[PDB]
Design a protein around this ligand. Structure first.
Ligand SMILES: [Mg+2]
Length: 243
């Protein structure tokens, strides 16, 4: 299938309760869908070590080797790796940054990006500054590339409005697919009364190919594991693109 598939998920590695069982759960979801790209946030070393032992068909990239951090997985049979980098968030208080992988997908260049934007309500200012950095990097990416950003943005209220909205040619995939209610809230204290759309996917086409449109989006991980807990306090996002 010419369609690109991705999963994005904050794995809640800062919650050590039943972390091994929940990492097993995450791996089972990744295997079931076998996505072309995985964007992960809030990994810890023991967590990524576990995933690497089980997912040897994927290339791994991490946002750090200490504390907690993001990661990108690339399905090796489907995605050819070119290079990677980390862009620093100079005023983060929580070690946040921007992890980027450049690949080719059936001859088409893709820039793949993930971040775990600053957490907590009162860091709204710093989170907004980080969002501006992300949107600038999306806009500035080489024009022969499709850009996909997926991550835990921690966004709420009108923080996106405060940065000026999205740049020209950049869309929010959930919005683009019609703001469907069934896959709207990714963090839900009732079902996991506070429901928020923290996890978001931003998309920009390449100038050198027809516009990329999102095809389908769904939330995953909504089934309690044998241990009686969910894989994460976030739902994961599964999304495909008409490439
Ligand atoms: Mg957490």
């Amino acid at each position: 299938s010419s369609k690109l598939s991705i999963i994005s998920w904050n794995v809640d590695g800062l919650d050590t309760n039943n972390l091994s069982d929940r990492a097993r759960g995450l791996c089972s979801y990744l295997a079931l869908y076998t996505p072309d790209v995985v964007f992960l946030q809030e990994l810890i070393p023991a967590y990524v070590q576990y995933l690497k032992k089980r997912a040897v068909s994927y290339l791994f990239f991490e946002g750090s080797d200490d504390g907690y951090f993001t990661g990108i997985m690339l399905r090796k049979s489907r995605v050819k790796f070119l290079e990677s980098e980390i862009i620093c968030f100079p005023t983060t208080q929580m070690m946040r940054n921007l992890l980027i992988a450049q690949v080719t997908f059936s001859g088409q260049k893709l820039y793949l990006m993930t971040s775990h934007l600053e957490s907590t309500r009162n860091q709204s200012q710093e989170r907004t500054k980080q969002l501006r950095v992300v949107l600038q990097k999306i806009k500035e990416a080489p024009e022969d590339a499709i850009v996909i950003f997926a991550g835990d943005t921690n966004l709420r209220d009108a923080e996106v409005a405060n940065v000026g909205g999205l740049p020209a040619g950049v869309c929010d995939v959930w919005e683009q697919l019609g703001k469907q209610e069934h896959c709207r809230y990714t963090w839900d204290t009732q079902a996991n009364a506070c429901k928020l759309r923290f996890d978001r996917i931003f998309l920009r086409s390449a100038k050198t190919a027809p516009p990329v449109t999102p095809d389908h989006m769904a939330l995953i991980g909504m089934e309690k594991l044998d241990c009686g807990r969910y894989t994460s306090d976030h739902w994961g996002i599964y999304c495909t693109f008409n490439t």
